[PDB]
Every structure is written in structure tokens, then in C-alpha cells.
């Protein structure tokens, strides 16, 4: 599991990037250099980099001098432009504050560009005692670690569903419950409520049917929550008021990942499952982060995995 | 049994095709190179190619270099275009997601086309120790094994029967049964139901009569299932588990389809006709079990078994 | 749990070793060429060939033209010396009717060498279209098939222990039981009897204690059958008598494995388990073959697994 | 708290040592090069090597070209002299099947050192693109992983104490208790019995006092069973009997640990605790391995933590 | 018998090694040089060294000048390195305070290295009139004679087993006996006791059986002693209270010896007997040194040999 990190080179930036690969791998980061195992069918790294978004999460770049003077290329000509095309495409397919890079001293790229620092580091044939790259890597580990728990992906189709679900259902039900004296559900009068959100492991095809069977199987009866339209939710019967729900909105991301890749294959494919897991984990992270923002939701709304 | 795989080389790469034959056969894949024994009565490989669809399931080829300059041929002239003619006709008769290829480093064939990646390998006269071709064969096996369990054959006459059967009968009765409180079947009230589908080994001649004589001897009583839209006639066994049974009545469709697929001029059943029956039935089983494992109303309550 | 074949070849004739490995593996024959990961510990092929007698069952060698004409050699001063040395040491550690060979049609090694007619083949590029070599491999395969249940001819101590066990306990017990109606057996008549033999699933240090524990688990008494000295075995309390006994002589073969495998290693190794299981399989095969060969014990003794 | 490995190199080959520790820690082996903060109290690498006979488990070292050709050296008159003397000290204090060696393509070290296959590598700049070095480190890793759970070779007194304890107490008591139905046990019958062995988490001087205190914590009475002399153990009052005992023989190993270190210092250090607990874990592993090798105790005794 | 010392010179200190051999013999220290008769099967001195620990007790190294300049070697190269590897591995197999050395005037070794003073001596072809090396052999003697009774060998299994024996058994029985007014042993009351320990001449196979067979034929009956766990011992009846015991802990060192040497060699060997005697004498020395230091053990616990 863990976060996927991608470092890019044309034909010579291999080992001075593999050092960062190994150090990040020491921190349980599945960092895949551009030629480990995924990109073997892909003849070039450009067709891989055009698929880095929402597939290889964060990324780093390393460039040196040995591929900066003169060389002929196969797919392109004047390969000296291929490195900067790679850098620009990688920075465009990830977004700012999510795509990092470094370069060698004397690399024909500016030290700073687009508000992202691109330090130039030394040669130091063996790098383990080069305590200038080391601080940068120690920093990047903790900066990325801050950006798994923080889902600043508002453009992504998962996060928009997450924020819509949170703000328009969880916030609404919690605000409605703090209106009448304590709680008015199914005749009996409760005192406190802890909302439960159950995110499925795999979405498959349709979500409403799964929610229906899941609620039927666990002996859960409907409730009325009045707020514009009153909300229908689910409560467990065994005054604690353990409210339960499954996000119905996940059908949107289900269809999105179905259409995202050319799918002429009945049933679930491993790539489809991996994309499913990525989108759902980002949805879960965004939902938790929004939950941890509002004071009325600090502790009264919990999300669990089943 | 197992999957059937085809490999195609013109007249000089047959050795590196035999190597892939051996490696696939080590993974329980039945592999028939285009000159094993079946195609000997066939005068050329092109009739075998026009008889490869729905018969050899998946397909592969190996592209070479030593037959790429000039040579005279019997059926054709300028045989040097037959490598790409093979690669085109073979991706035609089998379709995408059912045809693969491997090619030499720098071979005179397209690097990629039609969404089918064609990985490259070098000659390596020490073939068994080339950890580039072996990786390609390993991942081709891993790709294939993901396509036995998932039947992407919507054009096939069996997969459409599977989709129709599921969507119009199994999903329909599953939706109908989750309408009334627990169960209302023949007056008596059970709690939960287990739909069971029985796919025969062979379809014989007619399916309705086979169902009638199967359920006359196993002593199962009929039931009325009323959906929102015509009621679905099913049968529930009497011995509170509600084990509903049914056999796909529509398998006679695929029986007739593969009777008309091949020229059947002989009365009675035939070995090749049996092979086509088994192929279509296993594809139907795969498609139905995949559609069952999709919808949550069907994953558990509906099970397909072999009688 | 299948037969193992060791294929030995020079560093330049490894292609034929690989091809024969594939051909034998097509018959469910676990084949280990001298260059697998198991032999990375050992330094040279001579060390791995020295202990091939019991570790690797049968074997086969391939001698090629490129390692038989000119090379400087490392262990010896001449590869021409080397190849005949490995052939000799292999044919010595395995002996007659337990080792074969192959070589090029033009090799100076003669066809018949103290037995086992050594066939010929040609360097025909890719070998999947050689009828001669394939026919050779096929009759080799049928040879191992016909000599896997025959047993041994004075080989590893499993067979001699099996012969001793049968001819000194089983036959004498059965003769004693048939010499008169099986009436007494501690005062209760039984008519027919069954003598069940239970092979311990692994050689576990001292073996009589294991038999005592296993028999005590089933609440099994001791009977007193008379034959020179009376023989004592177990009964399992009268239409058909049932009698049990566990091979106690396997302690000797376990201790023999202990000596053969030099061990300052305090514990069990995968190598020790492999040798133990192979030698128990040999003992079991010898015993079953020899009990179905005879007439008194054709049907009245059953060998099973615990 | 895992396996530990010590890697030593000259002041210039520290690059190779760093790469090897990277490779080993990628395969879950805690590796300490001589340059760490642990060896600051020691003066020279020879004095760090002074106590590596048992402190740092397995060890491997590296020699290069120009730390083995010409230099002045500080401790000796020649760096070649220093490297060969240091390798001699390591190979002596570690021995066979517990040490390994790597050396540069031009190194003058012999390919054989009274055994132990010496691999061979080169200065290929950054070491993440070295196939042969990676494979040899991988075989080392597999050897270490398949070797750490076996036992010892007459090494630190943990293994000899384990063998003595088992073969003089556990086997004797188990054999005496299975020699007859466990009926008496001070006048009350139990049939089956369980012989629970508790390993103390840490060694604190005298251990029989610790045993008495711990047994009194559970209100345990003493029993007497006859076997030479009657062996007295503790019971835990009856379908299945249960017996307890913690190794009293650990007093000898604790005193050995105290004597092997300085006397003037009072109070335990982190180093003492680490070495002590490591060797205690070794004793526990040896005991459980020997138990699963034996017959009576395979399923009838339990070794657990206090 | 007496102390055994191994001395090492490569090819030019042979006369210088024989002189130190003679001067150690003058103090009755049996000296085996590396090529008397034992090491004839060993092709090189390196495989002689790989068994020098615990077999040849002490050690002395002799350094010569004509073996320091230049000479091609067989097992190594640049015998300048081979002698130093010798001096390092010999120190690694014996350690500090158990390994001494002598070096020629101007020899390329430190004057003081690793806590071993390496004294200087010139050639002096007539060695018997050299009052420099005679004085140094004298101080070697007065160092060694202090180190037979003092067994500071806490690493060696014999010493740790002895420490365990004393501290866990003899101290406990002495403390229990000096508790009630005079004596309460088998009902009868005595006044003073002489506990006695019978060190076996040979490790046999299991000291349990030897203990029973020895105590049965002296008509010695068991005694009950109460201290955690009670103590069972042996007392003779013919008020002197001669209690008896036999060290049962010697089983561990036994199995350690027969596992230390690879044993496919059934039966005892001269090497086995030599290790036997060395381990037994070390155990007896350690126990008798621990006994006289204490006050409760100096007088009432005597060690005897049958
Ligand atoms: N609760 C209990 N445990 C037992 C008994 N006998 C042996 N053990 C356990 O087995 C350890 C080693 O026993 P050993 O090899 O026979 O060698 C033993 C033995 O030769 C002797 N020894 C120890 N305890 C006794 C004893 O209670 N009676 C006698 N006669 N000798 C003893 O000292 C050696 C080391 O003893 P330890 O350090 O104590 O460690 C002992 C102890 O943990 C017993 O009667 N009761």
C-alpha cells in the first residue's frame, strides 16, 4: 500500500535518482522509478508520464549534465529538449505543491520556477555522506506525510463527491439534530448521537442496492430527520442512538472510474480495483478532514471500513 | 481441458514459437502451434486461421526477421508481407483482448497498434536464460488467467444469453423477492432464499423437456413469484431455507447456434460438436458467475452449480 | 513429492541441460541443473556432485564439443580433464543403472562406458525439433518410471531395513497367526485378523516413544502372540481382529541421517527434512512392494500414514 | 529487536559499507557500520572489533584497491598490514559460516580463506545498478534468514545451557510422567498433563528468588515426581494437569555476562541489556527448536514469556 | 598432560620456535609446534588455526625478518600479508590475555598492540646465551602459571556450567543445611556434614545413568532437603554426614563436544578424548576456585575424583 512516488530520467539519470528511491523505500514509500515493472510494455516514459495523474500520486525529478550536451533520440529529435518536456509534463499532470524536483549543479534549468524550489546538488559519486541532499529528503518525507492525511484535491472527482456528501448530508443531519430538546426518533427520545459512515471496500456497479441489503442484513430500521427535505437515515435497535449510513454518492466515482479507462472486459480487473481503492481512500481522507473541521462534528460523526 | 492457445510463425521462427509453447504448457495451457497435427489435413495455415475463431480461444504469435527479404510462396507471391498479413488476420479473427504478439527488437512490424501491446525481445540463442522473453511470457500468462474468469465476449452468442438470462430472470426474481416482508411462497412463509442455477454438462436436443424430466425425478414442486413485470414461474423444493432451483431454459439457443455454426451433416452427437458445446457452456458459466458477483443482491443468494 | 533428477553440464553446454530439464519436467520430474540457487553455497560443481548420491536420486550428464576441445579451466589445468572428471565422479556417486549421459555425435568420448550406452546428438540450434534427442529423453523417462517402484539393490539403508522388518517381524507374526485359529489373543476369539502398519509421518529423533504415545492415544492394549521368542504387538478392541505396530527400526535410519549430514546445527534443516522424507518414501515403497509380492502378507498387512 | 550485522571497511570503502547496509536493511537486518555513534567510546576499529565475537551476530567486510596498495597508516606502518590484520581478527572471532567478505576487482585478497566462498565486485560508481553484487548479497540474505532460527555451533553459553536444561530436566520429567498414567500427583488424578515453561523477560542476578516470587504470585504448590533423584517442580491447581517452571540455569549465563564485561561499573547499561536479552532469546529459540525436534515434548510442553 | 601451548612461525623462526618450545618444557608445559605430527593431515596451517580455540590453550607467535621482505606464497600472496593474517586470526581465536607474541628487532608489528606487549629480540644464532629472550620466556612462564587455576573463561561453556552448578545448587544446599539447629536428614540428626562431588573421568553419554549406576553400588540412599524447589541429594549410612552428588550438568558440555566436531565418525577419537579431558579439567578448576572463595563452601563441600 502506502503512497506511490515516481522519479523520472531520460536515459542516464538512473542511479543518482535510485539513491532517493532507496532512502524513500526505507520509509515504506512505494517509490517506483520510471523503469521498475509497470512501464515495461510502454516503450517510452512519455506515455507513462501522460498517465501519472491519480495513478502515481506524488513525484520527484532528478536531472544531470551527461544528457544535456548532445545526443540523438528515437521517438523525438534533439533529446536535450526531452528532459524539460518531461519536467513540464510531470509538473502539469500533478499540480503545484504536489510535484517536486531536484537537479544537478549546472543543469540547464533555473533553480526556481513556478514557486517550486528546484535545488541543484553536488556530484559526490557516493551520496550517503552528502548531508545536503539528506536534509532535503528528510524534509520531503514529512511534507508528503502531511499530504496523505490532507486531501487538497478539490479538482478530483472523488473530493467533490466527498465535500458534497459531507456538507449537504452529514452537516445537515447533525445541525438538524441540535434543534429540538434532545432527539425525536421512532417515538423514543434519545439524548446523544454518534453518526457512523460505512465505506465499502469495493463499489462494483451500484451502491443503493448494496446499502439496501447491508441495512437489511444488520436489522436496521429507518428514521426521520427534519431540517430542506427531511432526511431518511438508519438506526440500530438492540439511549445511545448509533446512527448508521453508507455513502450513496459513491456511484458517481464508480461510474467515473468505469469510464476513465477503456473497459471492454466484463467483471472487475485488478487495475480497476486499484483505481477503486485509490479513489475511495481519497474520499475517506477528505471526509475525515472535513469532519475534523466543524466543532459540531469533532466526535459525533465517525467513518468505519467494512 | 484448460485454455487453448495458438502461436503463429511463417517458416523460420517456429523454434522460438515452440519455446513459448513449452513455457505456456508448463502453466497448464494447452498450446497448438500451427503445424502440430490438427492442421495437417488443412493444406495451408490460412484455412486454419479462418477456423481459429471460437475454437482456439486465445491466440499469440511470434514475429521474426530471417524471412523478411524475399521468397517465393505457393499460395501467395512476395511472401514477405505474410508476417503482417498474419498479424492482421489474427487480430481480426480473434479480436482485441483475445490476440497477442511478441516481436524481435527492431522487427519490421508496428511497435504498437489497436490497444494491444507488442513487447520486444532479442534473439538470444541461449533462449532459456533470457530474462526478457520469460517476463513477457509470465505476464502474458497472468493477463490470460484474468480472462478465463472474466468473459469479455459480448459479441459471442453465449455471452448475450448469459446477460439476458441474468438481467431478465435472476436479477428480476432477486428484486421481486426483496419486496414483501420476508417470503410468501406457496402459502408457507420462510425467511431467506437461495437461488440455485443448474447448468447441464450437455444440452442434448431440447431443454424444456430435459428440465421437465429432471424435475419429475428429483421431486420439486412449482412456485409462483410475482414481480412488479409478468410473474416468474419458479420451483421450490419440499423436504425454512427456500432453495429455489432452475435450469437455464435458453441453452437450447446456444445449442442451435453451434449446430448452425458448423455444417452438421451427421445424425447424432459428434466429438467436435461436443467440444463446441463445452466451450460455449463454460463461457456462459463464466459470464453468469461474473454478473452474479457484481450486484450485491445476487452475490450470495444466487449460486451456479454443475449437475 | 516427485522424483528428482540432477542434470550436469559444463558452463557452455547449459542449453542442453535446460532443454532436458524442460523435457523431464513435462513428465512431472523435479529437475535441478547444477546452476540453480541451491548450489550458490557450494564453490565448484565438484562439491555439489560429491553429495549427489542420496540428495538427488537419479541423474544425467551432457558433454559438448566446446567444453571438450580447448579451454584453460579453473579447478584443473584442462577442461578436457575436467569434463571426464565430473563424468567419472558422477558415475561413481550414482553407479550403474542410476546415471546416464549424452554428448555430441563428434565427441571423442566413446559410446559404451562400463555400461549405459551413451547416445549421441547434434548441435541443432533449437532442440524442439530433434527426433533423436527427444526419443532418447523419452526412453529415459520410461526407464525412471519403471524403476521408481522396483526399489533398491543394496542402496541407502531404507531398503535393507524394510527387508529386515518384513522378514523378521511381519512374516513371522502372520505365520504365527495362521499356524492355528486366532483364538486366544488374551482370551477372546477373533477368526480373521488384520495387521495394520502405521508409518510415522516424519523421523522424529527416538521413534519408540512416538509409537508409545500414538498407541496410548487410542487406548490400545498389548497382546501376546507366540511364534523363536514370542512377538509382542498391539490390538484395538471379534469378527475380524485388527492389530497395529509402528516401525521402530526407523530410529536407526534417523540416526544414520544424523551422522551422514554433518551437524553442529542444533535443529532441523530443509535439507534434513528432504533427505528424511525421501528415505521414508523409499522405505515405504520397498515395504509395500515386498508385502504385495508375497502370499501370506498379500492382503493381511496394510501400510498407512499417521 | 531483530537480527544484527556488523560491516567494517577502511576510511575509503565506507561507500561500499553504506551500500551494503542499505541492501541489508531493505531485507530487514539491523546493520551497524563501524562509523556509528555506538563505537565512539572505543578508540580504533580494532578495539570495536575486540568484542564483535558475539555482540554483533553475523558480519561482513569490504576491501578496495587503494586501501590495499600503498599508504602510511597510523596504527601500523602499512595500511595493507592494517587491513589484513583486521580481517584476521574478524575471521578468528567470528569463524566459519558466520562471516563473509567482499573485495574490489583489483583487490589482492585470495579467492579462498580456509573456506567461505568470497564473492567479488567492482567500483561501479553508484551501486543500485550492480546485478552480481545484488545477487551475492541476496544469497547472503537468504543464508542469514535460514540460519538465524536454527541455533548455534557450540557458541555462546545459551545453546549449551539449552541442551543441558532440556536433556536433563524436560525430557526426564516428561518421560517419567508418560511412563505411567499421571494418577498420584499428590493424591489426585489428572491423566494428561501440560508442562509449561516460562522464560523470564530479563535476567536480574539471582533467578531462583525470582522463580519463587513469581510462583507465589499465583498461589502454586510444590509437587514431587520420581523418575535419578526425584525432580521437584510446581503445579497450578482436574481434566488436564498443568506444570510450571522457569529456567534456574539462567543464573550461570547472567554471571557469565557480568564477568565478560567490566567489574568496576555498577548498574545495567543499554549495551548489557541488549546483549543479555539477545542471548536469552537465542536460548529460547534453541529450546523450542529442540522441543519440536523431539517426540514427547513436541505437543506436550509450552514455552512462553513471563 | 599439563598445559598445551601452540606456537607459530612461518618458515624461518623454526629454530626460534623450538627454543621457546624447549624453555616452556623446562617449566613442564607440553608444547606442540604447528608441524610436529598432529597437523600432517592438515595441508596448511590455516585449517590448523581454525581449531586452535579450546584445543591448544595458549599461544605464542614468532616474527622473523627474512619472512617480511618479499616471497610468493601458496595459500596467500605476499607472505608479508600471510604472517599478519596469521597473527590476526590467532588472536581472534584466543583473544586478549590468552595470546602472546614475540617479534624480531625492527619487525613490522606494533611494540604494544591490542593490549598485548610484543617484546623485541634480535637474532642471536646462539640462543642459549641470550639474556633477553630468556627473560621474556621467563615472564611468559610467570604469566601463564597464574592462569591455570584462574579460569577467567566466562565465554567457554565449561566455566559457565560450573558457575551455574555452584551458584544454583551448592550455595543453596549449604544455605539450607546451615538453617536448622544442627541437621535434619532422613529423620536422623547429625552434627557436621561433608558434601562431596564426584567429577566423572569421562563425559560418557548421559551423566544421569552414570550417577545411578555409581550410587547404586555404594548403597547410597536419597535424602530430602528443603530450602523455592526442594533439593534431592544422596547420603551414605555406615555423625559425619557424608553427602554425595555427581555433576549432572556435564551433559550439556558433552553434547557440545560431540556437536562441535562434525560427527559422521561413530565412536570416540583421540581428538574427542583430548577435548573431553580439557573441558573436564576446566570445569573442575572453575568449581574448586568458586568453592574456596566462599566461606560456607570452603570446608563442607569437597571435590573428589574416582
Ligand atoms: N525445579 C527443579 N528444576 C530442576 C531440577 N533438576 C533440574 N532442574 C532444571 O534443569 C537445569 C539444569 O539441570 P542439570 O543439567 O541436570 O545440572 C544441574 C545439576 O547437576 C545440579 N543440580 C541443580 N539442581 C539440583 C538439585 O535440585 N538436586 C541435585 N541433586 N542436583 C541439582 O546443578 C546443575 C545446574 O542446576 P540449575 O542451575 O538449577 O538448572 C537446572 C533446572 O532448571 C529439579 O529437581 N527441580
Numbering used by the authors:
A (entry chain D), E (entry chain E): 1 to 227, 231 to 241, 245 to 312
B (entry chain C): 1 to 228, 231 to 241, 245 to 312
C (entry chain B), D (entry chain H): 1 to 227, 231 to 240, 244 to 312
Show the paper's wording.
The overall structure of the ElSTING dimer closely resembles that of the SfSTING dimer, comprising an N-terminal TIR domain and a C-terminal STING domain, connected by a linker. Functional assays confirmed that 3′3′-c-di-GMP is the sole CDN capable of activating ElSTING-mediated NAD+ degradation, cleaving NAD+ into ADP-ribose (ADPr) and nicotinamide (NAM) as observed in SfSTING homologs.
The structure of the fiber bundle was resolved at 3.7 Å resolution. In contrast to the spiral architecture of ElSTING single filaments, protofibrils within the ElSTING fiber bundle adopt a straight configuration, mirroring the linear assembly observed in SfSTING filaments. Notably, the interactions between the TIR domains of protofibrils contribute to their assembly. Specifically, F128 within the DD loop of one TIR domain packs against residues Y19 and F128 of a neighboring domain. By contrast, in the protofibril structure, the two guanine rings move closer, transforming the U-shaped 3′3′-c-di-GMP into a Δ-shaped conformation.
